[PDB]
Enzyme design. Sequence first.
Site, short mmCIF file in Angstrom:
data_model
loop_
_atom_site.label_atom_id
_atom_site.label_comp_id
_atom_site.label_asym_id
_atom_site.label_seq_id
_atom_site.Cartn_x
_atom_site.Cartn_y
_atom_site.Cartn_z
N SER A 178 16.52 16.48 10.85
CA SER A 178 15.35 17.07 10.21
C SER A 178 15.52 18.58 10.22
O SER A 178 15.36 19.21 11.27
CB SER A 178 14.07 16.66 10.91
N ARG A 179 15.83 19.16 9.07
CA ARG A 179 16.18 20.57 8.98
C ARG A 179 14.98 21.49 8.94
O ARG A 179 15.15 22.70 8.79
CB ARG A 179 17.07 20.84 7.78
#
Lengths: 539, 114, 421
Positions: C287-288
């Site tokens: 999850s950036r």
Amino acid sequence: DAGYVSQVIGPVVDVRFDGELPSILSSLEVEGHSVRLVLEVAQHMGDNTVRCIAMDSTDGLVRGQKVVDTGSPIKVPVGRGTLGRIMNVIGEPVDEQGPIDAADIWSIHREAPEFTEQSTEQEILVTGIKVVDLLAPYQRGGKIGLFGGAGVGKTVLIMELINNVAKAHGGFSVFAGVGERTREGNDLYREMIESGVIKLGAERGNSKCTLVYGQMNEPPGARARVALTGLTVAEYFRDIEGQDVLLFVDNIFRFTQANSEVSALLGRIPSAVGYQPTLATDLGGLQERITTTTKGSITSVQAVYVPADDLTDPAPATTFAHLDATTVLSRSIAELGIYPAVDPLDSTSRMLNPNVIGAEHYNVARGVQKVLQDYKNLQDIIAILGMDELSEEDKLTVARARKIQRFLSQPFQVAEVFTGTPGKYVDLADTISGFQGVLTGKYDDLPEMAFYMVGDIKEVKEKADKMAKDIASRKEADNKKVSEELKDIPSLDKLVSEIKEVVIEEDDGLEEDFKAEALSSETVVLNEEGKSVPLPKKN
Amino acid sequence: LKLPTAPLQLSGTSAQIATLLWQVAAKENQLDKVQDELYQFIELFKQHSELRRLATDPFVPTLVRTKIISSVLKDSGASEITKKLFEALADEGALSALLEVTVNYEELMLAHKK
Amino acid sequence: DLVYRTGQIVNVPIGPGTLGRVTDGLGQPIDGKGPLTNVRSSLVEVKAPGIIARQSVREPLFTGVKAVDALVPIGRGQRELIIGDRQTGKTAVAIDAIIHQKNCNEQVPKAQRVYCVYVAVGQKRSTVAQLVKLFTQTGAMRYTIMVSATASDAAPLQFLAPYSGCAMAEYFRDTGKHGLIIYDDLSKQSVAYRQMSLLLRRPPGREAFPGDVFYLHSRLLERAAKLSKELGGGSLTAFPVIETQAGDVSAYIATNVISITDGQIFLETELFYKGIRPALNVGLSVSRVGSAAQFPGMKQVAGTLKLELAQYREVAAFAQFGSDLDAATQYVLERGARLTEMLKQKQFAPIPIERQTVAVYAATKGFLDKVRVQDIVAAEEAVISQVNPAVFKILKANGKITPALDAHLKAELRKVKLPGA
Ligand SMILES: Nc1ncnc2c1ncn2[C@@H]1O[C@H](COP(=O)(O)OP(=O)(O)OP(=O)(O)O)[C@@H](O)[C@H]1O
Ligand SMILES: Nc1ncnc2c1ncn2[C@@H]1O[C@H](COP(=O)(O)OP(=O)(O)O)[C@@H](O)[C@H]1O
Ligand SMILES: [Mg+2]
Ligand SMILES: [Mg+2]
């Protein structure tokens, strides 16, 4: 003397010119479009027709719409007036700070400089990353490439190179955002607004960065040329003002991908994996311009997407020959938790001569690579048998390489919003001495994960004694009136009255400002005179 | 709309011109008229080289092609079907098709005289 | 036949009159409840909001799935890919995400509500009717639109239905409200686009897809944004779903949408049959937005949970040899077994975030080390139903685990009985 639109197939427009066709690469302005649409001539089709790629979307183009030739390629503002601004592919400001004052209006299409004006002067660029300054040291004036698949840390590494190199640097910088997420483009813009790199308003002259953005939402015509636009802004600083420029290109893969998005509609049969036949020559025509000449220097950092971490794909594997230092980021380094996930046995530099960085640095780097490669050879036994069939023959190479693997890891200042560890900046002599200490055996008594995510070799001992405190605290932390319900805390039900209630409506407030529209029950079309009539009953 | 049916069906895009050229010349009863008018252009393309330049050379503008064919056929009492025909082919550059329309106009004329 | 131009680029009805309705890919309602009333016609292909029109993704969007609020946290305005094989849990995570926004919209004011849009491209009418029945039985249809271009529909309708659903969801992004758009089977939208472009004689490319099948998805997924406060501060959270073929994420559309979106929730068909449901591959799931968009308190347990799961993954591939007890690796192995059994979850019942962070705090502080591996899904339910319900009422309000609360429940977690010796 003008042209009219002949054909529209997606992002590719054919324009028909009654006499005096424009040259190839010329910019054409569609007259009467809602947003300003610019086409760039890609080829002469043969029958007074040019075939063009559009820099904006073509929905709303009518066959016969007038197209006026500008007589020149896509021309963008350059100079000090672009510092602290965000530019479009066609040089429009998209930062809402008003128009761009321009020293000049340069064409974005140029020849690569020449062979006589080439600069063969190699000097190091100390970046502050341990693995980079050890194993693939970057060249001050050279081309740098960060290869890696999606999600391995190229964007974070290039942010770390922005605040680690471009911060304390004399010349100006250009960030060419080529086909990346607009969220992280806005994130870079805000992180440079609050850092003082870009100053707004009246201090805009003291900005030391130019942003050119061609992000993912835009058509392939814009993404294919935004790298040329950012390179034009850097080439102005290199040639005319004559200084040391930094060009950060995020995702140079997107340039080639946007070329291949239109290449089949430009009438070219496809080459291998699905790319255009003109893949290497487009890549070279861009990349041979990003060079240190004798006038100035452009030390460029280019992220390269490697599609599904397959480095043999022609778009990553073609741009290896254009770089001086390639930083191959790996997924296998990343799920060990090591960040930056730089593959030590795939990252190369032309600065790894003993003539250039000296012998006592090169010997440390070669010894580190030798130790890690022999550990990679031993992993087909010591992941199978269990390190009891080595008898300290090669087991100091395992215990040395496992410390070297964690010691290559380093926290980042830009990644403290992810990682609960403040960032570190390591000097070059410090990391040389630290890695020499592990590969010789000066630090063979320490724990292994004392090396993980530390600054330098003082900090591995500063973490070793911290763990040698906190191993002793794991026997008694329960009682002694130390975690009880009236030592330091109130009662449980009093805190439910300590909080105060927020108000909820569940009428949801949607129709507060909504201006509706009476939808047509039946469909309504245009007659031959252009007026909205219902659909006629003649079926 | 309501045209007389062709004596025999034919191929594509060059005989479909000659079928349509036959179908309008039959409503005018000028079937033998334009078959004579088509033959005169075939000797005319044999005579002049500046006329068959308008059918082979790809560098004449499509304005100059459609003006010259009109500027010649203002006169001479050529049938109004053929001077509408040659303006249709000059706008599209299909003046090369006349040698293939004529051989497809022939067997329509042959199967009309049976 | 005569073709008359309507003079309009392709429109859809957007507005508050679409909430609750089941529409097709062009906007016409198919639920048999008459025409859409309280709406207006907006465009289908808009430009995504630019660099100035956005702000940073800060506030979280709770899914209710425990394995994604802890490991793959999701912010309001990001694009999180749900990529997996067939029958692994993708639509399940999407449905849990919508049902949880129904459960959350009752406890938040009107500026915090999330209105869901579900775009069903290439599914059956039976599956879509099943989902509409589920959302009416739960109560999610007062917040949900369903834009369904089913498999019998034309390929241009299945191609235009994500853009139609995103334009109906952009009303909430543009009015300062919050949206949640779920493009189920974006692979099927790419297949419909491939058909529509191969019949238009456009030259094919890799796997006979068009050249601009990346642009097809990038210009759609870039419309999910967190807007700045000048433009209302609205948000649109997109959950594209890409089905792979035997775990091949190196396929063309899989790599394209992995490249576009911020994160990815990678589910496995081998973890799915180990009992791990939702079948989340905790290594490859990224999850950036990072932990910048995580609930506090869940962040206080999540780095620990990630770190012990990272140890449990790597000291495994040796756990087949259970003979040699090593007592340092073995504690890590059975502790990671406690954590891996913790993140299992029955479907169609999303958990509130406070109960999730309490259930992970009860496993990362070692309260469950006595109970065996195979009986924690009843132990966590005993923990949740046996602590006082006033722990959560202030954990939700305080936002984080305060020092006046981490020793309250430190004693509350010991005064309950755990089903295991
Ligand atoms: N957490 C869970 N617990 C129990 N069962 C689950 C869970 N998640 C999914 N399932 C079941 O596994 C199956 C998964 O099907 P799902 O809804 O994921 O379809 P999909 O993978 O999205 O798409 P397709 O049907 O095309 O494969 C369903 O039968 C669902 O009921
Ligand atoms: N130095 C680092 N420290 C911690 N996490 C990192 C680091 N580098 C990358 N990551 C993780 O990897 C993810 C990849 O982000 P990003 O760099 O945008 O991917 P890509 O390289 O594909 O652009 C980030 O969200 C972050 O969580
Ligand atoms: Mg990126
Ligand atoms: Mg599904």
